[PDB]
Design a protein around this ligand. Structure first.
Ligand SMILES: O=C(c1ccc(Oc2ccccc2)cc1Cl)c1c[nH]c2ncnc(N[C@@H]3CC[C@@H](CO)OC3)c12
Length: 270
């Protein structure tokens, strides 16, 4: 109502029910909006984000909507800490989900997770919207087991320099192509590279990429033209798809539309 833009939620409409996590960028809670609608609420740690820039971008993000993309419902901007209100994903972070061996996943389930992410990324690519930090840690799983992409574009607003360039301890070296590591060349094709690493994470049940190497060793490995190798659960055709994302020449990597077609082919064949 009065006093709130279309991107703004009145925090008085929130009922906080459970804490989900705490970390460097804040606390995340599960709650309800207007008593009925499940939401996740991220409380942004003071000093961690370029908040005015994020708020302007939130207005853009409100217009992104796809069934495999975590939905932004709004932001609470009038007080501190500010809140980001989104779709609630009851089964939590994809990385944690993959690592729970009890699930005893079939490879068909793993391929479906890859397809969910690929559909979201094809949508983002169609909107010329780069994710910039695609990885299993940035995906979520709902109570039906559907994977959705989260945190899209958020890295642009992080103030901590450990996160923000290639040298930093928190930069996603293991999800980055050579041109990012060598000269900070971000593009659609750096999201493609990261997607291949994400497929590897899925088929490896959440292992760390290049688990025996440091970040510095990883950068050297990949810049020498060497790669991850085939997870045991990936068929030859699945491995071909993820490996295609890692061409040294960015322009020789597929688009998300092509990847989606290839994933659907494998689903039909296997
Ligand atoms: O973490 C967010 C979230 C992400 C980005 C965002 O902001 C953005 C989203 C998209 C683009 C840019 C920013 C907001 C929010 Cl609230 C969640 C959104 N829905 C959720 N449902 C369940 N759990 C969630 N988080 C926990 C946190 C603890 C973790 C421990 O393993 O497990 C998953 C979330």
């Amino acid at each position: 109502g009065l006093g709130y833009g279309s991107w703004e939620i009145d925090p008085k409409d929130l009922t906080f029910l459970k804490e989900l996590g705490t970390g460097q960028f804040g606390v995340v809670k599960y709650g309800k909006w207007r008593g009925q609608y499940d939401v996740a609420i991220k409380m942004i740690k003071e000093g961690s984000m370029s908040e005015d820039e994020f708020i302007e971008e939130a207005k853009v993000m409100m217009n992104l909507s796809h069934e495999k993309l975590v939905q932004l419902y709004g932001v609470c901007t009038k007080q501190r800490p500010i809140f980001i209100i989104t779709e609630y994903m009851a089964n939590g972070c994809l990385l944690n989900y993959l690592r729970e061996m009890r699930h005893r996943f079939q490879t068909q389930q793993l391929l479906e997770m890859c397809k969910d992410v690929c559909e979201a990324m094809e949508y983002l690519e169609s909107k010329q919207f780069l994710h910039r930090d695609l990885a299993a840690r940035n995906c979520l799983v709902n109570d039906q087991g559907v994977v959705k992409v989260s945190d899209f574009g958020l890295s642009r607003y992080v103030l901590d320099d450990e996160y923000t360039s290639s040298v930093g301890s928190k930069f996603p070296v293991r999800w980055s192509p050579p041109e990012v590591l060598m000269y900070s060349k971000f593009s659609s094709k750096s999201d493609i590279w990261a997607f291949g690493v994400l497929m590897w994470e899925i088929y490896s049940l959440g292992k760390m990429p290049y688990e025996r190497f440091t970040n510095s060793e990883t950068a050297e490995h990949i810049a020498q033209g060497l790669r991850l190798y085939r997870p045991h659960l990936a068929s030859e055709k699945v491995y071909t798809i993820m490996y295609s994302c890692w061409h040294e020449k960015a322009d020789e990597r597929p688009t998300f539309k092509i990847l989606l077609s290839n994933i659907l082919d494998v689903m039909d064949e296997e």
